[PDB]
Design a protein around this ligand. Structure first.
Ligand SMILES: Nc1ncnc2c1ncn2[C@@H]1O[C@H](COP(=O)(O)OP(=O)(O)CP(=O)(O)O)[C@@H](O)[C@H]1O
Ligand SMILES: Nc1ncnc2c1ncn2[C@@H]1O[C@H](COP(=O)(O)OP(=O)(O)CP(=O)(O)O)[C@@H](O)[C@H]1O
Ligand SMILES: C[C@@](O)(CCOP(=O)(O)OP(=O)(O)O)CC(=O)O
Ligand SMILES: C[C@@](O)(CCOP(=O)(O)OP(=O)(O)O)CC(=O)O
Ligand SMILES: [Mg+2]
Ligand SMILES: [Mg+2]
Lengths: 327, 327
């Protein structure tokens, strides 16, 4: 009496940020977002539901995860089980294909992969849209990893209308790259879920954030239509900076930046001034991702080696949507 | 046919920031502010108006200043001359008593001192209030350096009603200190005048800044009345962070922070967690000022030597208002 399934899902990085929930229980977002799915970084996950299991078990890179480390996994299992009316404990075994000690965020690829594996195990037979909705409920950013290339998460107004979709771009995503700059001098960081909640509830800058998301999204779409990279880059760099601005107005205020983050951001500006078109973005942590055209990627990598070891500079390209496998 | 005068004025650091002009021509501020005048850092200035001078001349620490370096000085001379109906070119000789290469902001102490010296030379015989109004027109933050200890700049609504005054605190300012952490890894920085203008005109976060200044000011006043240092510190640290937040929402966005600024801010947080009550604040540049009680200053200095040379840690205490001298 067992049911099992497997999936592989790639990470995505938001160019227009999701920051703050309109509904915390269903992870309905206050604003729509837009991401690029990447090839380099991904998660492979198997799940087994078995009547003979005695508790939920989560293994990550071969290491048994403790209660706190399993929290998003455990909550997703309960909600997928309630949706299937399944009463069995599960075993989740996941492997993250990210660079050693990089400290990448893996909730997007991990919960997306877990959602795909559960869809297979429990025979839910979900469409891509409904698979995105399911993964949304484990982690908002996971719903975009269902899709490859550019994807948009439409905020919607309901569990039924909040989900992601691919954005066709005439293969423009295949001309682009993202160079990760790995920064480790970071303080202990508020989780994305807790930080965005504190920002929604207390930041005097959050209305300014909301008032600007939709125009940024429209201009990303216009830029994609004309393959206008400097225009894309200027929009997404300011969007990310605006997102981080909101945490300095929270109560108490906080920042995700480390000293190295600022050095990296300053160097991106110098690279642009030397004529290398490239634009930075940060999520809920100190790493700095640099959006650049493929033709300019080695120039950018060379320039940045003056201050960062080669271990600290990891390129990624456009990647595919989720893949499901039977066991 | 010559007229001369001299003044000494001390720097002040704003605990509640002035950020943005409601009227650029007269430097009427969008919000009121509140500062501590310091003992360690000051400017001495002599001015001579002479019918036989052939142009305005500004000497700073014995170095002839070029046109761009003289701009605020030159503009103040023209406006004080128009107020006296004086037609003579001037020579300004100023010396800044600040630490070598520290990169301290000297417009407050320098324009205040210049205003005091011109008041003497031209026999304007100004009250402290009217001297504050005069200095306001050269540089907003200079109007607070007329006064010692705590001073408030009331935004007013007119050239007549915008000026600073001392805040009596039952000598509480004499129990306090400010430890400067000198940071030099800073990019080339937008001037305070240009940055605050860009923030007023373009930042989506500026309304959030305005909406919070008056409650911060009220709570500083309540804290002064009860000599409640942790309450003072929490208010002013968040006020400063909110000020810097506004520049990340400007168009284009920018920051005054350097990598070292963030390291310093993180270390202040660690110091507080080790039980040292201290609170940071930054102006339009990378240096970090740390407000601390005198009894806790050497503990703070010791703790911080783990990451900064002793040249980088300069203490200051409460200081006096402006002093005028005849020639
Ligand atoms: N490969 C994986 N497979 C399944 N679940 C995973 C996983 N990697 C992480 N998780 C789950 O996601 C949780 C971490 O997600 P969370 O969103 O809080 O952090 P993160 O890594 O995405 C950085 P941030 O908090 O800034 O978004 C882990 O505690 C675990 O429950
Ligand atoms: N000791 C002094 N005496 C007279 N004028 C002085 C002076 N020191 C500086 N100044 C004047 O003030 C100008 C600098 O003021 P400004 O406000 O732009 O810079 P600042 O040193 O206060 C840092 P910030 O721009 O961040 O406030 C100088 O160019 C000069 O005109
Ligand atoms: C900063 C971000 O990466 C936010 C990541 O937050 P999460 O998606 O991890 O949060 P939950 O929805 O609460 O699970 C920006 C983005 O991915 O859009
Ligand atoms: C960041 C601040 O130090 C602003 C200093 O700005 P200035 O007073 O130098 O600007 P102008 O009025 O245009 O001369 C905060 C403060 O002193 O209140
Ligand atoms: Mg995450
Ligand atoms: Mg100044």
């Amino acid at each position: 009496a067992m049911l099992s399934g497997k999936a592989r899902a790639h990470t995505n990085i938001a160019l227009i940020k999701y920051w703050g929930k309109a509904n915390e229980e269903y992870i309905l977002p206050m604003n729509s977002s837009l991401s690029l799915t990447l090839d380099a970084f991904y998660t492979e996950t198997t799940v087994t539901f078995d009547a003979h299991y005695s508790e939920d078990v989560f293994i990550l890179n071969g290491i048994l995860q403790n209660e706190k480390q399993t929290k998003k996994v455990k909550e997703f299992l309960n909600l997928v089980r309630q949706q299937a009316d399944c009463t069995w404990f599960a075993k989740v075994e996941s492997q993250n294909f990210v660079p050693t000690a990089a400290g990448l965020a893996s909730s997007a690829s991990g919960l997306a992969a877990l959602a795909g594996a559960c869809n297979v195990a429990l025979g839910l037979n979900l469409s891509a849209k409904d698979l995105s909705r399911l993964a949304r409920r484990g982690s908002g950013s996971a719903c975009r990893s269902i899709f490859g290339g550019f994807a948009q998460w439409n905020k919607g107004h309901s569990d039924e209308t909040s989900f992601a979709e691919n954005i066709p771009a005439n293969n423009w995503e295949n001309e682009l790259a993202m160079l990760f700059i790995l920064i480790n001098d970071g303080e202990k960081d508020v989780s994305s879920r807790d930080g965005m909640k504190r920002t929604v509830e207390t930041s005097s800058f959050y209305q300014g954030w909301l008032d600007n998301v939709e125009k940024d999204l429209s201009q990303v779409h216009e830029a994609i239509k004309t393959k206008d990279f400097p225009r894309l880059g200027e929009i997404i760099e300011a969007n990310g900076l605006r997102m981080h601005g909101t945490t300095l107005g929270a109560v108490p205020p906080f920042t995700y930046w480390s000293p190295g983050s600022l050095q990296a951001m300053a160097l991106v500006r110098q690279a642009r001034a030397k004529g290398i078109p490239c634009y930075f973005t940060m999520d809920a942590g100190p790493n700095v991702k640099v959006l650049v055209e493929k033709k300019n990627l080695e120039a950018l990598k060379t320039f940045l080696s003056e201050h960062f070891s080669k271990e600290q500079l990891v390129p990624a390209f456009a990647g595919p949507g989720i893949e499901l496998f039977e066991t």
